[PDB]
Structure 1
């Protein structure tokens, strides 16, 4: 009646998580079952399974409710500017729309957070410095991004009971997909610098909706389902949670090909 740090690490090993892996986690903590330490049991079991050579990652994003006040060019009206809290990678809370684990991971001692606010990842472990260094502010889901570094390092993504449409790495596949009609989001973001608040415009492919028209908003779940149905990845229980584990480079290439087949040439 209690999933422990030991039992969860055993479930993670049986699922496919290995010593030295860089693992990115999307979790629905309620579905794991009753935990002795709450979400920190999940974090501890992941660190135990990958060892000091591994790295645990999560999608942090940023809690910035000021997006309801921007006009049409994405800037902030002058009456609201100095009221918007600027982004500090060490103090800005992770978004909690898709669960509380990224914030729990962000506040775990040793965790590093990248510089692109809306696309920030948290990393804890051996390669946390490289995974979070020099995050390009424009198109933060693309070439120089932590999501690209996860693919390059041969990392893995674990859907720990979370809905399959929340896989952030598939936004990296959307950025890479050579297709037409890609939607773009522009917004101004306040940054905290040792001299005050400095504003800056951010450009990236819009990850608030499907990258192109004609797709259901949860269509990431279909891509993951087809990926598993093709005999790739592994499925199994983590505690009481139905979980999915995929290779980062494989699911990205599968996601790009999924898009380049139905759209473009």
Structure 2
């Protein structure tokens, strides 16, 4: 049978999602079961559960398919530059590699989208403007980023059936961790401007593979599983989906400690 916006809100409240929360969601929509409005049922239920003073967020990123073309310095070959679609935070699609919910949130009326393309978040609700403002273009998973703001605001992250290694916030722990050997990525990015396309080199720690050597690609999942084993966070069903709800500040500190124990001096 169908789960509804009402039934999902009951499940979310039971799992610990609280009135006024800033909630970042990662979802595997099919695992939730039958939904009367599909992915939009999830968005509506989240909004119902945090209420008007809460904020609903997701990781947008952008497709940036031209990245396959760049040279070893990260630059776009001259013959391709004119063809590459520039980033526009109001128009560029969210990436769909981990389901359609971020794109569906992006196109829900009222949603705002932050300005660092590959690190961009979407936000809908009371603090959406603040969460998406002034996203630094370099090291966009670090200080002053939407992820840093989620920690500062005491926000939460919900894995709604999503694979645990897709918890984007742990890239903020990677950025913060005092460990050596961090992998740095440099890539040229085109930005839409009223005066035309402006290209800029972006530098950040790589988030496409673990920040340091010796880790499997899915190592974030193990960090989350250890966090839960330590007695932190909450687990329960949302619809039919096994789900995990964690405090943003708590999981970030745990991930920093996890990395510093294994790679620090």
TM-score, normalisation: structure 1: 1.00
TM-superposed CA distance for 1:13, in Å, is 0.3
Distance 1:169 1:108 in 2: 23
TM-superposed CA distance for 1:64, in Å, is 1.0
Q: Deviations over 1:28-81 (max 9, x none)?
A: 000000100000000000000000100000000001100110010001000000
Give structure 2 stretches of 5+ with no counterpart.
Answer: none
Paired residue for 1:225? 225
TM-superposed CA distance for 1:160, in Å, is 0.1
Distance 2:218 2:103 in 1: 24
TM-superposed CA distance for 1:201, in Å, is 0.3
Give structure 1 stretches of 5+ with no counterpart.
Answer: none
Q: Deviations over 1:160-191 (max 9, x none)?
A: 00000000000000000000000011100000
SS of aligned partner of 1:256: helix
SS of aligned partner of 1:189: strand
Distance 1:191 1:210 in 2: 27
Distance 1:85 1:117 in 2: 12
Distance 2:246 2:69 in 1: 38
How many residues align? The count is 265
Distance 1:5 1:252 in 2: 30
TM-superposed CA distance for 1:195, in Å, is 0.6
TM-superposed CA distance for 1:21, in Å, is 0.2
Paired residue for 2:85? 85
Q: Deviations over 1:175-233 (max 9, x none)?
A: 00000000011100000001100000000000000000001110000000000000000
Distance 1:74 1:237 in 2: 43
Distance 1:104 1:9 in 2: 19
TM-superposed CA distance for 1:264, in Å, is 1.3
Paired residue for 1:152? 152
SS of aligned partner of 1:147: helix
TM-superposed CA distance for 1:125, in Å, is 0.2
User: Any runs of at least 4 consecutive aligned residues in structure 1 with deviations exceeding 6 A, and if so which?
Assistant: none
Distance 1:64 1:70 in 2: 11
SS of aligned partner of 1:83: coil
SS of aligned partner of 1:19: coil
Distance 1:47 1:170 in 2: 24
